[PDB]
Amino acid sequence: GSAVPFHGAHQAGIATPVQDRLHFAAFDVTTEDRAAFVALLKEWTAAARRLTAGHAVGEGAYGGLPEAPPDDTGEALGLKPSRLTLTIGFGPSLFTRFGLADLRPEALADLPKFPGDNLDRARSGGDLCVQACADDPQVAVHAIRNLARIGFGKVVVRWSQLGFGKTSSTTPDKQTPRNLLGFKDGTRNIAGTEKDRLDRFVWAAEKDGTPWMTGGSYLVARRIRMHIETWDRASLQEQEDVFGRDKGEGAPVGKAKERDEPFLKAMKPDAHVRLAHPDSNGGATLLRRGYSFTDGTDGLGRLDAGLFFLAYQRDIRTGFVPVQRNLATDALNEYIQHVGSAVFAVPPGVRDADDWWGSTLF
């Protein structure tokens, strides 16, 4: 129920331990006024300082002038901060505005078309995004709602996604959660304490060639539908072959414990873990931080389930792209379909109370 510090060299919500709930919103910008947008970024930062500490935005949720609408919408009154983090990112489309063209990072690469892609253009892209994570879904929703409210007339929500439960882990000392296929998801990830691996694989560095991004990261979001009818009639051996780990313990095939190291030669050549593993991709490593979702029925008598996949990396060209290219023959492809996509540059952290989101860009 505690708070996660908001200030830092990096934004919270990446190496932070993975909270139970997600509310992710992508915003489109609707103002041409650079100064207006900078003022928005500063107002948003002030709101975020309150929200992550469990305080109401502005003058609060009541006790103001009767004839005026309250500053804070109020549905989080009395709740703890609940480990709320708020992480902002900038989409490639943003750099066509406010004369930012020359400032677009090289590592903010557009993704190529991948085989099997069925991307819904409505639930894709976006000028910027805010990832709200908390252990309380009301806390996460209240944050997105109030950021959207403050930005009325300068940004509009393009699409959003709620994740009802995590399918990732940055804390290998706690239980690994399971995705909706029933497998543990997050065993071999980067941990928030492996400072060296975060510097190597996650945080942009000055020498990478975009100085304002130093201390930030790059995010890939992929909305992935799961064919659960198909999966649920597959044999247990089939399910375990697809991944290369057994379902119960989550151990690599042939080994006894979840965290024993995989021996890749023992897995099928098209097993997911075998193809995604750093050793199969020249060392490419990702920080996965995704969440499961279900959005009702599919109108055909079935539950509609999926995984909202989020990966942070130092450079999209050396993280997500090579691994996803190596997944072209993945046995998992039979059971999933990518239906939404977006990339964002996640700027460095807000260094102190006089700093603000995006200060190093603007």
Add this chain to the structure above:
Amino acid sequence: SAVPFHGAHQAGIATPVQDRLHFAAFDVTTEDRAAFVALLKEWTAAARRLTAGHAVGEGAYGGLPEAPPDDTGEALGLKPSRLTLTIGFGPSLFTRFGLADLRPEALADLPKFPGDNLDRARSGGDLCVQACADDPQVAVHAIRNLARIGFGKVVVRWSQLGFGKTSSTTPDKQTPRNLLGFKDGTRNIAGTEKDRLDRFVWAAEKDGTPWMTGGSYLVARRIRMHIETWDRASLQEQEDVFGRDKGEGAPVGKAKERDEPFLKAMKPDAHVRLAHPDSNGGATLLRRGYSFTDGTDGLGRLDAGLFFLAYQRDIRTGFVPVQRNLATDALNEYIQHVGSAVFAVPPGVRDADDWWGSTLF
């Protein structure tokens, strides 16, 4: 950590309200009464396992490599999480299996109400399963596996996820707030008031339908909120709408949330004044609904609201009169009912040999 599954009544009505909801309505595809009774028996056996935190059937793993696992496995390593599973029968069920003359008169069709905008695809249903738990994954795993067990005899018609309080961080003494920012539940039937339950919630034998004794009747309404419009309303407009202040939730003119309201100090069309039993001939409801947020719609607005669930001894003397009295509710400016269903919720599963629906079939 767990809630007993067996009892005179089904759990999940008078038992403590859990943090999360997964509500599913199903349509029946088989015409074979025997096949359906077999399914109800299999479902009950699975519900016994699920509510105790165990996998269904032979388990999620460790069986024949060439067989699909009995349980889909995404709840392995989780606790029971106070999971309750409550099943109900819709009016349309009674057109099958020769049951037409066993439909309770208290399971009334709802009239059309002013301002209804009901999505047919998210309304109705032959039966429902209300899955409540503190962990949303436990709830979803339950619905997912019951649907799989029933495949070929039932399909999912519509599904709704919801959330209330988060108990790890919030005291249970504390009234949760709905997404309009107001405390919600102050004057409600509590699970501890056994005589109020008997008077207002549980069906009695003399009520006219013996197989329903110890059951109850459920109304579900998916109520969208116009969030962005609400949020532009002055603080005084918001408080006038309900008849309670926003910070403390006290009735107008009083000091404490639990002060009994003075109805004449509220505006004539204030929500509490129109919903209160004194304005409806004593009609009193057990509310057990959940907030929802499904995402944002095509115009960028927040798809959010209250998945309203009311239990009552008779729909004709519970939900209908009160909802009727809300025709002029000042709240109507900010909400819209977009889904609706009613169900007969049968009595409880008495012991290890009983099953869901035994008194009806």
